[PDB]
């Protein structure tokens, strides 16, 4: 077996049926314009070299066999400092079916880049993307696919949401091509549609602002002859407004 | 040195022709992997990251016919590097965010081969496990934080988990001394979690931490209660003193809202309203109503009876505040 | 297969430790880049992050093969088996390649001997920002790289025809600045270990001040107007005048402190520092105006707004 | 090339079950799913269900859940659809389609008209 | 499921002219919207896969287009062979098909 | 040589004489109830398999030979996350005396847990512990000892 | 750490006589205890203590190749907070219980730039 050559080299195009099971949709960092997501990134592909016939039909093995055989060099186009978990052992599974099909699942914590247009912040919704594909192999050599229907190929665990100020409405997937001077590369994209929960900002900036303006309008009921009281009423409210604005900008990049 | 040569021959036989890629009883019944934890410490229980750092002596015991010897009577405690040459379960913590086996002096691992074939494999693991906390009653809240030990690659047809020693598998939880938490209870659960790839064994070690309220009296509750009592002083100043009463009122209101914002900035941006938020907003109502009581006094005078309003406030504000405290603490405590 | 034998023949008797044409001629390396995104420019730490697809090609007579196959397109597995130039980045505080799911490397070998080797990098390059005028500062942030150990006589670099394949700038994390353009240079730096050819990419960034206006400039102008309004308040109201002046100047001190906190620790006055200093002068002057008035108002009511507007024109035009 | 041959047309009384075959020869049978589509005369194409031949994993439409049963013979490389409790509306033309990937159905069946009376 | 709507129920156009057949998807379908040609008493034939990708063996006159829910199949010059029933089907979710546009003269 | 077997396995308890030279007592992080300490953690033990005769009575080597031979699996009971400094090279020294004695020192930065009872803060004092021992070997297998007087 | 992009930043060069030129691009967070009694008017002295760990003076020997030209690039260092007034190279022999080892000390006598604190700290206090 040669680890350096893809299956069916020179005769076929290696089709990899990928799939994502979102174990937990991690917190969204608006400051870094990125989001964390822990997944069971599964890939499946046919390799005629790894065809056997024995007492068992499927060989469930560990990562040691995964390192010994060819696996797709899938990388996330907008990934930023992802980690493949290693405790206790490399969190990977390899399963060689007797026909030659491989099922290679890995547990990942991918910190993908999500460019956000914060024009309507905090009443804003963002379609955070997750695009992945082969790095070294062009569309003529490695093509990706969804193992199930595209709608049913990115499953999110029910009690997995780690979002604090966001609501995962859903996800939508697609497949496309990236043009490059190096070549044409097949890309699998999935957009997670998040909607920011305004609850925190209502009681952190909106309520203080409304109470401050009502406090300033309280001065219209004080007698005009009380100059120090209404003067401090006004100046303290304006200074509070400046502090509120400055402390509201720091919540965003 | 003869027994040294005998043990060398035995271990060389054990490692000779050993397929690390194949689990015990491969193509057979699942191997029973018992587990037992020794909680060294629980640290950094932070709600901002919704996680907790757990240091533990994580032991797994499993039978392995390939690692059975009978010439030597004693139990062979081998150098930790031999763990790299032996099959070990591929367990992981599903809610783990950042974990590591301790490094110095050497890899904090233990391998102990018993004559019957039992393998005692121990690790000293520091894991930052994720615990999604419900801060609705914070700080008067009980948090159920879990560790989810699971086999990643081997299904229930290839591996089984069980708490070795039943309820006595996990020890050292009582000796843990969290700064602001009390571990009132802990529980051990054995489950079978089904994913699209199959059914996998699961061990859930759940601690029900109870948050200590004493610190939050010192930093959160008592200062706001004192500020409300201070705002009550304005009722004892005559209505003509516009500057004094207005300064007292606005200073108290602004310090209250500043306290609320400063406390909430440290915590994560959770949307719902907490118990500390409930108390702070309630006392903000009291202080803002004190300021609006002076406002009403000034309007009614300029724009006997005004002394009546001031006097009735002078006694009703502490009474209504005390009843608010009664209702709040009765509901939450 | 017909390709595995080619790789086995190529790597047979292959000395990975020796550069191509060692002791014969310098190895010419053509480098190209795809700037995927210029990350955040940390003016506080004088560094900026850049994500690139760095490509370098060179000829290796050892890696030449004749067959029907034109190229050997390979993953990261073969990167460590053949000789790769030791290209490091001279101004990188910390750089790291991408490894998820596998190492993000590509390697292609032509018949003649061309070895196109590309990899994805996230360089925290060191840009020596000179914020003498802030937040209007414009910076030409460089990105140098050269062979770490091979002198000019052993490894020569050169820029391919495609200068830099800069990506679309809409998705860049560059909030503070705007990418103006790129420029390349190639110069022979002399050091103790020898002469090394260094190739540098200058990205020209121009700062935007909108966030700083709504963050610093607007609050300071509003507090200066708060200082102004003291004049219209009756002079007889001693506590009112004094309270307004003290609140204004003290919150001006606080605003100056936070605005300087936005900046790094550098010992020179910047444009923002000049503006906050002038605001200090205005608020302190209003307080002293009432101090001398108690111990004129109409003159201040005109002079303060006019002086502030004229200073604004002079300052902003620069 | 790829050729999907289906059983010839047949007529059956209402309430009597019937089976329709789909034989593939050009490609390796177990690599791609086999879908079944019903088309009544003058109406839109309607999806019944599909079978993964390798493990015989089946998914059915809600309307045809229980009306149709999908089976497979890997050795004969044939896909079988079994319709039970036939009614008047079940008279239609049935095709078997081969799904190359998530995008398109590559090769369709020739068509098995079904009539009840 | 996703309901596909064919706006032109039956289009009548002469030979040699541009004709566009529309297709609407109830929900998001991405680029998983294929077009099929079915002559009378014949099985469907794939023409356009993806959203605009032309299937092999298809004349260049056929051209697909569409991003999210609006999809169009355009014939630059109608030939005598281009008179048949045209269906649009989505494979993003479980497969469904439209009513089927018929071309006439 | 089998580096998986401790000296005197099944015959004798491995006497490990250990001492500590604190190059710098690092800052105390009372917020985390922990403290840093930089040490030359020296530990010596007899090993009969490493007897030799030659021109030199002491073989002064580097970390490579330390990896090749058996070394105790010492670990710090209250250590949180320590660092074994290895720049420019693994900061370890291994000296084999001709009689078989081994001296194996190593530069460490132990960040150890120090539980503080801050009742008298800031006028308080603490006794921060630094506990260590074999991770896998019990008292009947290896026993630790101070190479000099315990005070010294 | 030693930088490792694109490859490990390291150099080996064998000369015909036998000299082995060996270079590393190194980032060190070196400890420097500061006597801040005169801060911000403080002239801090921070050192880098190069030393052989396992080899005593009987086995290894250090020296600065070039008496004072062995360390360069100090002048171009434009430290935003400090001004590097001077730097010295020292060679010593430190004695531990294990033996005597060679030591090289690279000491910088940094000087604080008072202007930043004048603008930031002193001026607000004076105006107050
Ligand atoms: C002092 O101790 C420290 C540790 O305490 C040592 O640092 C470690 O050194 C080892 C060995 O050099 C490194 O292992 C290598 O890791 C490569 C990928 O590393 C990435 O993942 C690890 C997590 O596992 C991260 O920690 C890394 O990030 C850190 O390191 C990089 C530099 O590498 C820094 O820039 C970062 O800032 C971090 O500090 C990385 O993200 C891994 O690919 C490599 O394995 C290949 O090479 C070996 C060589 O023998 C092969 O056997 C192996 O099969 C692999 O080869 C395949 O892949 C290459 C990829 O190009 C192909 O070319 C090949 O053909 C083949 O396909 C190796 O395992 C380790 O990462 C590093 N850091 C740790 C442990 O935290 C210091 O070296 C040591 N000494 C000094 C002086 O400091
Ligand atoms: C090599 O390693 C083996 C395995 O550990 C050692 O053999 C075991 O030694 C332990 C000593 O702790 C023995 O444990 C004791 O067993 C008594 C009898 O229990 C029987 O029934 C249980 C039912 O599960 C079996 O598991 C067990 O094997 C016996 O058949 C118990 O009465 C003891 O209970 C209590 O003992 C003391 C107080 O008396 C407490 O401290 C204990 O915690 C416990 O509560 C105890 O459990 C065990 O029987 C031995 N055999 C096994 C496990 O098969 C060897 O000694 C060791 N050889 C060495 C080190 O040279
Ligand atoms: C995720 O976690 C897994 C845990 O499984 C890590 O995988 C292990 O990593 C270690 C360290 O890299 C591996 O240890 C290596 O073992 C190799 C084989 O050792 C046997 O064979 C040699 C002779 O070939 C014998 O000497 C030895 O006693 C064994 O019999 C060694 O060849 C390796 O040597 C390398 O490191 C030493 C360190 O001293 C150097 O001196 C060498 O020059 C050489 O560089 C090394 O010791 C271990 O094999 C891995 N697998 C397992 C199952 O433990 C992963 O590293 C970790 N991270 C990632 C990203 O996966
Ligand atoms: C922290 O929070 C977690 C939540 O994830 C809690 O974990 C769950 O705890 C509950 C309760 O312990 C588990 O639910 C059930 O526990 C039963 C315990 O036995 C009692 O009930 C049976 C049946 O009524 C009685 O006969 C018996 O006498 C006891 O009174 C188990 O028996 C249950 O298992 C049975 O039901 C399930 C579901 O129907 C079946 O699948 C099983 O095969 C079996 O028939 C069940 O386990 C629950 O499982 C725990 N895990 C979850 C919900 O994921 C922690 O307890 C909590 N910890 C702390 C400290 O607060
Ligand atoms: C920052 O702070 C550090 C403190 O660590 C200062 O470093 C000290 O600098 C002084 C002066 O440069 C050093 O003093 C030296 O003492 C030597 C004698 O002691 C050594 O002697 C031999 C070498 O001959 C060693 O093997 C032995 O182990 C001793 O360590 C002198 O030989 C030195 O040179 C000259 O000394 C006198 C005058 O000083 C002359 O008359 C002699 O002829 C000779 O030429 C030198 O005096 C001291 O060792 C350094 N280390 C310390 C104190 O620990 C840094 O200088 C400071 N930073 C700056 C910028 O000054
Ligand atoms: C320091 C202040 C103390 C003052 C104490 C006084 C006590 C004040 C008590 C405060 C109540 C505490 C509320 C906490 C709950 C969070 C808010 C929330 O849930 O809203 C939710 C509804 O969405 C909205 O409400 C947005 C609509 C605007 C609301 C603000 C109106 C301002 C009125 C202007 C009038 C100005 C006056 C006119 C001039 C006279 C959004 O929540 P969510 O997270 O996005 O999730 C979805 C909704 N869900 C939660 C149901 C699922
Ligand atoms: C139901 C139980 C609820 C439980 C809660 C209990 C709530 C009850 C508390 C109610 C408040 C007590 C005041 C009530 C009387 C006010 C009216 C008044 O002015 O009366 C008199 C003065 O008032 C006094 O005699 C002062 C006594 C209270 C001062 C306490 C200060 C201690 C501060 C400690 C704080 C430290 C904080 C420690 C931190 C925790 C005289 O009034 P007058 O002007 O002469 O007018 C009347 C004459 N007329 C009739 C002719 C008009
Ligand atoms: C990036 O670097 C490259 C290489 O240094 C720069 O391209 C080079 O630009 C010079 C001047 O424009 C070219 O020289 C000129 O070429 C033309 C066309 O042949 C000729 O008519 C002129 O007389 C002159 O010789 C040079 O050829 C060209 N390099 C290559 C390989 O073509 C490029 O400008 C740099 N990008 C910048 C600065 O943005
Ligand atoms: C007659 C009287 O008692 C006066 C005394 C204080 C006055 C309130 C102050 C704050 C005002 C904010 C906004 O202008 C809306 C009206 C508003 C609530 C006012 C209502 C009338 C009051 C109660
Ligand atoms: C000089 C140069 C040019 C292009 C590449 C390159 N090679 C690939 C392979 C795959 C993928 C996804 C992206 N690659 C890119 C970067 C690219 O072209 N993008 C992002 C549009 C490398 C070096
Ligand atoms: C490769 O083979 C062809 C034809 O056999 C020959 O012309 C050419 O010179 C060869 N190239 C080599 C040996 O480098
Ligand atoms: C959804 C909960 C909103 C709570 C609003 C604050 C209640 C304060 C009560 C004060 C009583 C005097
Ligand atoms: C917004 C006005 C607040 C007024 C509070 C008065 C409390 C005591 C009322 C007694 C009426 C006689
Ligand atoms: C809180 C509502 C108070 C209403 C008081 C009405 C006052 C009317 C003006 C005549 C006396 C000031
Ligand atoms: C004067 C009474 C003020 C409110 C007293 C607080 C009651 C705390 C109850 C705690 C639950 C047991
Ligand atoms: C934080 C700034 C306080 C005021 C400093 C005034 C001194 C003059 C600064 C401007 C010089 C051009
Ligand atoms: C009082 C008005 C302040 C702003 C003036 C801006 C003038 C335009 C400058 C643009 C650069 C030449
Ligand atoms: C010394 C501060 C300013 C004093 C001015 C008082 C009016 C002349
Ligand atoms: C008497 C002075 C009037 C001020 C006119 C407005 C100046 C901004
Ligand atoms: C170059 C030093 C400038 C110091 C700040 C200006 C005086 C307050
Ligand atoms: C480094 C020179 C400092 C100048 C101080 C100016 C005081 C107003």
JSON list of C-alpha atoms in Angstrom, two decimals, chain G:
[
{"chain": "G", "resi": 1, "resn": "UNK", "atom": "CA", "xyz": [10.65, 28.66, 21.95]},
{"chain": "G", "resi": 2, "resn": "UNK", "atom": "CA", "xyz": [12.39, 28.46, 18.59]},
{"chain": "G", "resi": 3, "resn": "UNK", "atom": "CA", "xyz": [10.30, 29.63, 15.65]},
{"chain": "G", "resi": 4, "resn": "UNK", "atom": "CA", "xyz": [9.15, 26.86, 13.33]},
{"chain": "G", "resi": 5, "resn": "UNK", "atom": "CA", "xyz": [7.71, 28.45, 10.18]},
{"chain": "G", "resi": 6, "resn": "UNK", "atom": "CA", "xyz": [8.02, 27.55, 7.42]},
{"chain": "G", "resi": 7, "resn": "UNK", "atom": "CA", "xyz": [10.55, 25.13, 8.88]},
{"chain": "G", "resi": 8, "resn": "UNK", "atom": "CA", "xyz": [12.28, 25.05, 12.26]},
{"chain": "G", "resi": 9, "resn": "UNK", "atom": "CA", "xyz": [14.35, 28.23, 12.40]},
{"chain": "G", "resi": 10, "resn": "UNK", "atom": "CA", "xyz": [17.72, 26.56, 12.78]},
{"chain": "G", "resi": 11, "resn": "UNK", "atom": "CA", "xyz": [21.02, 26.57, 10.93]},
{"chain": "G", "resi": 12, "resn": "UNK", "atom": "CA", "xyz": [23.91, 24.10, 10.73]},
{"chain": "G", "resi": 13, "resn": "UNK", "atom": "CA", "xyz": [27.08, 24.82, 8.76]},
{"chain": "G", "resi": 14, "resn": "UNK", "atom": "CA", "xyz": [30.13, 22.55, 8.81]},
{"chain": "G", "resi": 15, "resn": "UNK", "atom": "CA", "xyz": [33.39, 24.30, 7.96]},
{"chain": "G", "resi": 16, "resn": "UNK", "atom": "CA", "xyz": [36.37, 22.36, 6.55]},
{"chain": "G", "resi": 17, "resn": "UNK", "atom": "CA", "xyz": [38.46, 22.68, 9.72]},
{"chain": "G", "resi": 18, "resn": "UNK", "atom": "CA", "xyz": [35.65, 21.27, 11.86]},
{"chain": "G", "resi": 19, "resn": "UNK", "atom": "CA", "xyz": [33.93, 24.40, 13.13]},
{"chain": "G", "resi": 20, "resn": "UNK", "atom": "CA", "xyz": [30.18, 23.88, 13.45]},
{"chain": "G", "resi": 21, "resn": "UNK", "atom": "CA", "xyz": [28.28, 27.14, 13.06]},
{"chain": "G", "resi": 22, "resn": "UNK", "atom": "CA", "xyz": [24.90, 26.51, 14.72]},
{"chain": "G", "resi": 23, "resn": "UNK", "atom": "CA", "xyz": [22.20, 29.16, 14.80]},
{"chain": "G", "resi": 24, "resn": "UNK", "atom": "CA", "xyz": [18.72, 29.38, 16.29]},
{"chain": "G", "resi": 25, "resn": "UNK", "atom": "CA", "xyz": [16.04, 32.06, 16.03]},
{"chain": "G", "resi": 26, "resn": "UNK", "atom": "CA", "xyz": [14.93, 32.22, 19.65]},
{"chain": "G", "resi": 27, "resn": "UNK", "atom": "CA", "xyz": [12.23, 34.09, 21.55]},
{"chain": "G", "resi": 28, "resn": "UNK", "atom": "CA", "xyz": [12.84, 34.13, 25.31]},
{"chain": "G", "resi": 29, "resn": "UNK", "atom": "CA", "xyz": [10.63, 35.58, 28.03]},
{"chain": "G", "resi": 30, "resn": "UNK", "atom": "CA", "xyz": [13.49, 36.17, 30.45]},
{"chain": "G", "resi": 31, "resn": "UNK", "atom": "CA", "xyz": [12.84, 36.97, 34.10]},
{"chain": "G", "resi": 32, "resn": "UNK", "atom": "CA", "xyz": [14.06, 40.40, 35.22]},
{"chain": "G", "resi": 33, "resn": "UNK", "atom": "CA", "xyz": [13.30, 41.42, 38.79]},
{"chain": "G", "resi": 34, "resn": "UNK", "atom": "CA", "xyz": [12.99, 45.21, 38.83]},
{"chain": "G", "resi": 35, "resn": "UNK", "atom": "CA", "xyz": [13.76, 47.54, 41.74]},
{"chain": "G", "resi": 36, "resn": "UNK", "atom": "CA", "xyz": [10.90, 49.97, 41.08]},
{"chain": "G", "resi": 37, "resn": "UNK", "atom": "CA", "xyz": [11.73, 52.23, 44.03]},
{"chain": "G", "resi": 38, "resn": "UNK", "atom": "CA", "xyz": [12.64, 55.12, 41.71]},
{"chain": "G", "resi": 39, "resn": "UNK", "atom": "CA", "xyz": [9.96, 54.23, 39.13]},
{"chain": "G", "resi": 40, "resn": "UNK", "atom": "CA", "xyz": [9.25, 55.86, 36.73]},
{"chain": "G", "resi": 41, "resn": "UNK", "atom": "CA", "xyz": [12.72, 57.46, 37.06]},
{"chain": "G", "resi": 42, "resn": "UNK", "atom": "CA", "xyz": [14.25, 53.98, 37.15]},
{"chain": "G", "resi": 43, "resn": "UNK", "atom": "CA", "xyz": [17.28, 52.62, 35.29]},
{"chain": "G", "resi": 44, "resn": "UNK", "atom": "CA", "xyz": [16.45, 48.92, 35.16]},
{"chain": "G", "resi": 45, "resn": "UNK", "atom": "CA", "xyz": [19.09, 46.26, 34.49]},
{"chain": "G", "resi": 46, "resn": "UNK", "atom": "CA", "xyz": [17.87, 43.06, 32.81]},
{"chain": "G", "resi": 47, "resn": "UNK", "atom": "CA", "xyz": [20.10, 40.08, 32.11]},
{"chain": "G", "resi": 48, "resn": "UNK", "atom": "CA", "xyz": [20.18, 36.94, 30.00]},
{"chain": "G", "resi": 49, "resn": "UNK", "atom": "CA", "xyz": [22.08, 34.14, 31.76]},
{"chain": "G", "resi": 50, "resn": "UNK", "atom": "CA", "xyz": [23.43, 31.75, 29.14]},
{"chain": "G", "resi": 51, "resn": "UNK", "atom": "CA", "xyz": [24.84, 28.65, 30.80]},
{"chain": "G", "resi": 52, "resn": "UNK", "atom": "CA", "xyz": [25.68, 25.02, 30.11]},
{"chain": "G", "resi": 53, "resn": "UNK", "atom": "CA", "xyz": [23.43, 22.70, 32.07]},
{"chain": "G", "resi": 54, "resn": "UNK", "atom": "CA", "xyz": [25.06, 19.27, 32.16]},
{"chain": "G", "resi": 55, "resn": "UNK", "atom": "CA", "xyz": [28.68, 20.01, 31.24]},
{"chain": "G", "resi": 56, "resn": "UNK", "atom": "CA", "xyz": [31.02, 21.45, 33.86]},
{"chain": "G", "resi": 57, "resn": "UNK", "atom": "CA", "xyz": [34.01, 23.69, 33.13]},
{"chain": "G", "resi": 58, "resn": "UNK", "atom": "CA", "xyz": [36.09, 20.51, 32.83]},
{"chain": "G", "resi": 59, "resn": "UNK", "atom": "CA", "xyz": [33.95, 19.52, 29.82]},
{"chain": "G", "resi": 60, "resn": "UNK", "atom": "CA", "xyz": [32.78, 22.77, 28.18]},
{"chain": "G", "resi": 61, "resn": "UNK", "atom": "CA", "xyz": [33.97, 26.36, 27.93]},
{"chain": "G", "resi": 62, "resn": "UNK", "atom": "CA", "xyz": [32.14, 29.50, 26.82]},
{"chain": "G", "resi": 63, "resn": "UNK", "atom": "CA", "xyz": [33.39, 32.73, 25.28]},
{"chain": "G", "resi": 64, "resn": "UNK", "atom": "CA", "xyz": [32.09, 35.64, 23.21]},
{"chain": "G", "resi": 65, "resn": "UNK", "atom": "CA", "xyz": [33.62, 35.25, 19.76]},
{"chain": "G", "resi": 66, "resn": "UNK", "atom": "CA", "xyz": [34.67, 38.85, 19.35]},
{"chain": "G", "resi": 67, "resn": "UNK", "atom": "CA", "xyz": [35.28, 40.66, 22.63]},
{"chain": "G", "resi": 68, "resn": "UNK", "atom": "CA", "xyz": [32.39, 43.10, 22.18]},
{"chain": "G", "resi": 69, "resn": "UNK", "atom": "CA", "xyz": [31.28, 42.51, 18.57]},
{"chain": "G", "resi": 70, "resn": "UNK", "atom": "CA", "xyz": [29.71, 39.19, 19.58]},
{"chain": "G", "resi": 71, "resn": "UNK", "atom": "CA", "xyz": [26.44, 41.00, 20.36]},
{"chain": "G", "resi": 72, "resn": "UNK", "atom": "CA", "xyz": [25.01, 43.30, 17.69]},
{"chain": "G", "resi": 73, "resn": "UNK", "atom": "CA", "xyz": [21.66, 44.79, 16.77]},
{"chain": "G", "resi": 74, "resn": "UNK", "atom": "CA", "xyz": [21.23, 46.40, 20.19]},
{"chain": "G", "resi": 75, "resn": "UNK", "atom": "CA", "xyz": [21.45, 49.96, 18.83]},
{"chain": "G", "resi": 76, "resn": "UNK", "atom": "CA", "xyz": [18.65, 49.45, 16.30]},
{"chain": "G", "resi": 77, "resn": "UNK", "atom": "CA", "xyz": [16.32, 48.24, 19.07]},
{"chain": "G", "resi": 78, "resn": "UNK", "atom": "CA", "xyz": [13.69, 50.99, 19.30]},
{"chain": "G", "resi": 79, "resn": "UNK", "atom": "CA", "xyz": [11.94, 49.96, 22.50]},
{"chain": "G", "resi": 80, "resn": "UNK", "atom": "CA", "xyz": [8.73, 52.02, 22.86]},
{"chain": "G", "resi": 81, "resn": "UNK", "atom": "CA", "xyz": [8.94, 52.33, 26.66]},
{"chain": "G", "resi": 82, "resn": "UNK", "atom": "CA", "xyz": [12.68, 52.17, 27.43]},
{"chain": "G", "resi": 83, "resn": "UNK", "atom": "CA", "xyz": [15.95, 53.45, 26.03]},
{"chain": "G", "resi": 84, "resn": "UNK", "atom": "CA", "xyz": [18.84, 50.98, 26.03]},
{"chain": "G", "resi": 85, "resn": "UNK", "atom": "CA", "xyz": [21.64, 53.08, 27.50]},
{"chain": "G", "resi": 86, "resn": "UNK", "atom": "CA", "xyz": [24.29, 50.37, 27.65]},
{"chain": "G", "resi": 87, "resn": "UNK", "atom": "CA", "xyz": [24.90, 46.64, 27.49]},
{"chain": "G", "resi": 88, "resn": "UNK", "atom": "CA", "xyz": [27.68, 44.41, 28.80]},
{"chain": "G", "resi": 89, "resn": "UNK", "atom": "CA", "xyz": [28.95, 40.91, 28.10]},
{"chain": "G", "resi": 90, "resn": "UNK", "atom": "CA", "xyz": [30.32, 39.00, 31.10]},
{"chain": "G", "resi": 91, "resn": "UNK", "atom": "CA", "xyz": [31.95, 35.58, 31.42]},
{"chain": "G", "resi": 92, "resn": "UNK", "atom": "CA", "xyz": [31.95, 33.83, 34.80]},
{"chain": "G", "resi": 93, "resn": "UNK", "atom": "CA", "xyz": [31.99, 30.37, 36.38]},
{"chain": "G", "resi": 94, "resn": "UNK", "atom": "CA", "xyz": [29.03, 29.67, 38.65]},
{"chain": "G", "resi": 95, "resn": "UNK", "atom": "CA", "xyz": [29.41, 26.92, 41.25]},
{"chain": "G", "resi": 96, "resn": "UNK", "atom": "CA", "xyz": [26.58, 24.57, 42.21]},
{"chain": "G", "resi": 97, "resn": "UNK", "atom": "CA", "xyz": [26.62, 21.44, 44.35]},
{"chain": "G", "resi": 98, "resn": "UNK", "atom": "CA", "xyz": [26.94, 19.36, 41.17]},
{"chain": "G", "resi": 99, "resn": "UNK", "atom": "CA", "xyz": [29.98, 21.29, 39.97]},
{"chain": "G", "resi": 100, "resn": "UNK", "atom": "CA", "xyz": [31.30, 24.47, 38.39]},
{"chain": "G", "resi": 101, "resn": "UNK", "atom": "CA", "xyz": [29.74, 25.58, 35.10]},
{"chain": "G", "resi": 102, "resn": "UNK", "atom": "CA", "xyz": [30.59, 28.34, 32.61]},
{"chain": "G", "resi": 103, "resn": "UNK", "atom": "CA", "xyz": [28.28, 31.34, 32.47]},
{"chain": "G", "resi": 104, "resn": "UNK", "atom": "CA", "xyz": [27.77, 34.11, 29.93]},
{"chain": "G", "resi": 105, "resn": "UNK", "atom": "CA", "xyz": [25.73, 37.13, 31.00]},
{"chain": "G", "resi": 106, "resn": "UNK", "atom": "CA", "xyz": [24.24, 39.60, 28.52]},
{"chain": "G", "resi": 107, "resn": "UNK", "atom": "CA", "xyz": [23.11, 42.58, 30.59]},
{"chain": "G", "resi": 108, "resn": "UNK", "atom": "CA", "xyz": [21.11, 45.56, 29.30]},
{"chain": "G", "resi": 109, "resn": "UNK", "atom": "CA", "xyz": [20.91, 48.72, 31.41]},
{"chain": "G", "resi": 110, "resn": "UNK", "atom": "CA", "xyz": [17.55, 50.02, 30.23]},
{"chain": "G", "resi": 111, "resn": "UNK", "atom": "CA", "xyz": [16.36, 53.52, 31.08]},
{"chain": "G", "resi": 112, "resn": "UNK", "atom": "CA", "xyz": [12.71, 54.50, 31.39]},
{"chain": "G", "resi": 113, "resn": "UNK", "atom": "CA", "xyz": [11.34, 57.15, 29.02]},
{"chain": "G", "resi": 114, "resn": "UNK", "atom": "CA", "xyz": [9.90, 59.74, 31.39]},
{"chain": "G", "resi": 115, "resn": "UNK", "atom": "CA", "xyz": [7.88, 61.60, 28.74]},
{"chain": "G", "resi": 116, "resn": "UNK", "atom": "CA", "xyz": [5.10, 59.02, 28.49]},
{"chain": "G", "resi": 117, "resn": "UNK", "atom": "CA", "xyz": [4.50, 59.14, 32.25]},
{"chain": "G", "resi": 118, "resn": "UNK", "atom": "CA", "xyz": [4.84, 62.93, 32.24]},
{"chain": "G", "resi": 119, "resn": "UNK", "atom": "CA", "xyz": [1.98, 63.13, 29.76]},
{"chain": "G", "resi": 120, "resn": "UNK", "atom": "CA", "xyz": [0.00, 60.24, 31.25]},
{"chain": "G", "resi": 121, "resn": "UNK", "atom": "CA", "xyz": [0.60, 60.30, 35.03]},
{"chain": "G", "resi": 122, "resn": "UNK", "atom": "CA", "xyz": [2.38, 63.46, 36.17]},
{"chain": "G", "resi": 123, "resn": "UNK", "atom": "CA", "xyz": [0.49, 66.06, 34.13]},
{"chain": "G", "resi": 124, "resn": "UNK", "atom": "CA", "xyz": [-3.00, 64.99, 35.34]},
{"chain": "G", "resi": 125, "resn": "UNK", "atom": "CA", "xyz": [-1.78, 65.12, 38.95]},
{"chain": "G", "resi": 126, "resn": "UNK", "atom": "CA", "xyz": [-0.22, 68.55, 38.43]},
{"chain": "G", "resi": 127, "resn": "UNK", "atom": "CA", "xyz": [-3.39, 69.92, 36.84]},
{"chain": "G", "resi": 128, "resn": "UNK", "atom": "CA", "xyz": [-5.47, 68.38, 39.64]}
]
